[PDB]
């Protein structure tokens, strides 16, 4: 399903007071957090729905007509209109604009607000993979005053937990600190509770909430529910995944000049010689070799592309040592057993994984993705299950399908004669590399092209005056490298390059 | 082609190099010709993209921003496009050879890198670096940019 997240924000003057006016009020900074969340969701999940409500405010807005409870936006895909609506209250005097058009001061029932957000959840006609609600305050004293309403509120919250709603609470700015557990000590749905101090901290996890992460993060689904055939009949359902996948820009949309309507496009194939109109059955494909213009149908081409049925044809076992690094064709894929169609597939898969790990060999297999495709030989490397220090499976157990190139996949290169160098120069390079050595992490970079693309997208979506500029991590720290090295490069250059070498020419 | 370039380490190093496609995807350079089934003529065939009806001068390109649609002219995108530099191939850093896994091998081709054609000192520097990296179990992180319109790349 999707994710249901509702940002629940008080309006009872508990967000307008500030420790100092140089620091953001508990209100406006929450607005910035929510807007950042909207942006991140736009980047990540279009199909999710998010809502924002206000309670304790003087007026109200909700179908249940529960007073002092005003929904600002309902469970919907994020929209720039919503974000700018928040922005009009974001920052200084944005809370003043709020007071002017919205106001606050009244009390509420947390039972009542829980009822309202439960109504919001019942409203959506779409399946939610998660039931998240986000509460913004620094204070639990309103219902910390009366025990009856507090008991009713906690009973309602337990009920909503029974419904599967996961309540989460944030530490908000307060001069007297959050001072937790005045009401909220066990009224929080938590999978791992570790907060019991007064927590004068003005934040709990607001840093990443404000952090603009740029990723799509599509939900997991197998790239192919293929069948692994050992010989012809020992077949198991197997799941194939692109454990990594080069992301690309969203395609452009054809819009009108004045109304920006998505333009319905149609490319008819027609006889220009007679001005008539053609049909798919009315044309024939051709390729001319030498004096012969060979004419075919496209279909005939498709069936001459038919070699093997979709599946896996095990071709044998080759030791992992027999693999050349430069023999790479296209990014590898992950292999996982599936019991959906073949039961016992996972037991056999585990047996094979352990055995290939022992004997240190790869199962070379003839692979056909789907019909009308020439099967390819691919090496399946037994991929272990790797768990981090947190025992989180960082590398799943399975197999690594690497594509084995064919004879033509290479290209003849105008090689050059082999030339050696002095071992002193080798030591110079070793020392220089040691100077410029750096620890590698998988997520160490982003595509600056796509980054600035999203930056521009956000700017126009927010109709900004000027876009934020994406930083290019891929740009080297030339000054830092010169600082690290010194004249080692000059020494090696004199060791190698005579004092007439043209750097480029 | 010959792709002459410079391996750039900091600013103090610049070595003329020749890196070509070693392993790559294959496909014929001659594609089909959809001709008529009756006169076997392609010139009689014709496609006609039609926008509704309007011409190509009534249309712009747009982009779906979440729930919202954004007008975005191609001139504006080119102006705001992050533009890198062409034929610049600099080194980004040095990380352990064990740190990297072939599971993250991107692209569809394998590029073998030589030094400049007939540059003895370039070959000497290349061999010295090769031996150093080999003895150190060492792999080099580099930024690849083919031309001005090329996207910058991070590769091993």
């Amino acid at each position: 399903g999707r994710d249901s997240l509702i940002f629940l924000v008080d309006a009872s003057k508990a967000m307008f007071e500030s420790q100092s006016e140089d620091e953001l009020t508990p209100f406006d900074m929450s607005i910035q957090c929510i807007q950042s969340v909207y942006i991140s969701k736009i980047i990540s999940s279009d199909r999710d729905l998010l809502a924002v409500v206000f309670y304790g405010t003087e007026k109200d807005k909700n179908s249940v007509n529960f007073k002092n409870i005003y929904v600002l936006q309902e469970l919907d895909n994020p929209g720039a209109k919503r974000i700018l609506e928040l922005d009009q209250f974001k920052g200084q005097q944005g809370q003043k604009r709020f007071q002017d058009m919205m106001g606050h001061g009244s009390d509420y029932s947390l039972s009542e607000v829980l009822w309202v957000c439960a109504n919001l959840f019942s409203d959506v006609q779409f399946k939610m993979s998660h039931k998240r609600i986000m509460l913004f305050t620094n204070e639990d004293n309103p219902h910390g005053n009366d025990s009856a309403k507090a008991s009713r509120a906690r009973t309602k919250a337990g009920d909503l937990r029974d419904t599967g709603i996961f309540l989460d609470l944030m530490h908000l700015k307060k001069p007297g600190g959050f001072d937790i557990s005045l009401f909220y000590r066990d009224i929080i749905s938590i999978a791992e509770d570790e907060d019991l101090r007064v927590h004068f901290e003005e934040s709990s996890k607001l840093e990443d909430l404000l952090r603009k992460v740029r990723a799509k993060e599509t939900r997991k689904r197998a790239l192919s529910r293929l069948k692994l055939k050992l010989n012809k009949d020992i077949v198991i359902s197997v799941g194939i995944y692109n454990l990594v996948q080069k992301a690309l820009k969203p395609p452009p949309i054809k819009l009108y000049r004045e109304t920006n309507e998505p333009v319905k496009t149609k490319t008819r194939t027609f006889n220009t010689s007679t001005g008539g109109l053609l049909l798919p059955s009315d044309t024939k494909r051709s390729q001319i070799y030498g004096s012969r213009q060979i004419i075919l149908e496209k279909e005939e081409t498709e069936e001459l592309k038919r070699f093997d049925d979709p599946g896996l044809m095990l071709m044998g076992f080759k030791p992992l040592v027999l693999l050349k690094k430069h023999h790479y064709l296209r990014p590898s894929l992950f292999v996982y057993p599936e019991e959906s169609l073949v039961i016992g597939s996972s037991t056999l898969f585990s047996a094979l994984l352990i055995k290939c790990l022992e004997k240190e060999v790869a199962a070379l297999c003839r692979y056909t993705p789907r019909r009308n495709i020439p099967p390819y030989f691919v090496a399946l490397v037994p991929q272990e299950e790797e768990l981090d220090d947190q025992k989180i499976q960082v590398t799943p157990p399975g197999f690594q399908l690497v594509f084995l190139p064919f004879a033509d996949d290479k290209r003849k290169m105008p090689f050059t004669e082999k030339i050696m160098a002095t071992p002193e120069q080798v030591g110079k390079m070793k020392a220089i590399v040691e100077k410029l050595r750096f620890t590698y992490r998988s997520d160490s970079f982003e595509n600056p092209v796509l980054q600035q693309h999203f930056r521009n997208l956000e700017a126009l979506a927010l109709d900004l005056m000027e876009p934020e500029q994406a930083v290019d991590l891929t740009l080297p720290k030339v000054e830092a490298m010169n600082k690290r090295l010194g004249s080692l490069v000059d020494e090696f250059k004199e060791l190698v390059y005579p004092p007439d070498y043209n750097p480029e020419g | 082609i010959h792709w002459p370039c410079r391996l750039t380490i900091g600013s103090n190093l610049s070595i003329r190099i020749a890196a070509y496609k070693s392993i790559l995807q294959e496909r014929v350079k001659k594609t089909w010709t959809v001709v008529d089934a009756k006169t076997l003529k392609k010139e009689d065939i014709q496609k006609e993209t039609v926008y509704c009806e309007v011409l190509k001068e009534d249309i712009i390109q747009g982009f779906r921003y979440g729930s919202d649609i954004v007008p975005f002219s191609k001139v504006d995108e080119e102006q705001m496009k992050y533009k890198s530099e062409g034929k610049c191939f600099s080194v980004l850093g040095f990380c352990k050879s064990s740190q990297v896994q072939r599971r993250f091998f991107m692209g569809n081709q394998v590029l073998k890198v030589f030094a400049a054609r007939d540059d003895e000192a370039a070959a000497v520097a290349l061999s010295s670096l090769i031996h150093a990296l080999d003895d150190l179990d060492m792999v080099a992180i580099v930024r690849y940019a083919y031309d001005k319109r090329a996207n910058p790349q991070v590769g091993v």
Partner: peptide, 23 residues
């Protein structure tokens, strides 16, 4: 939940991008 992006439930925590860090 530990080791999970609270922004994207069912998705692991997203580290800051970071860059080259010489050793």
């Amino acid at each position: 939940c530990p080791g999970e992006s609270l922004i994207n439930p069912g998705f692991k925590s997203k580290k800051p991008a970071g860059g080259v860090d010489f050793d």
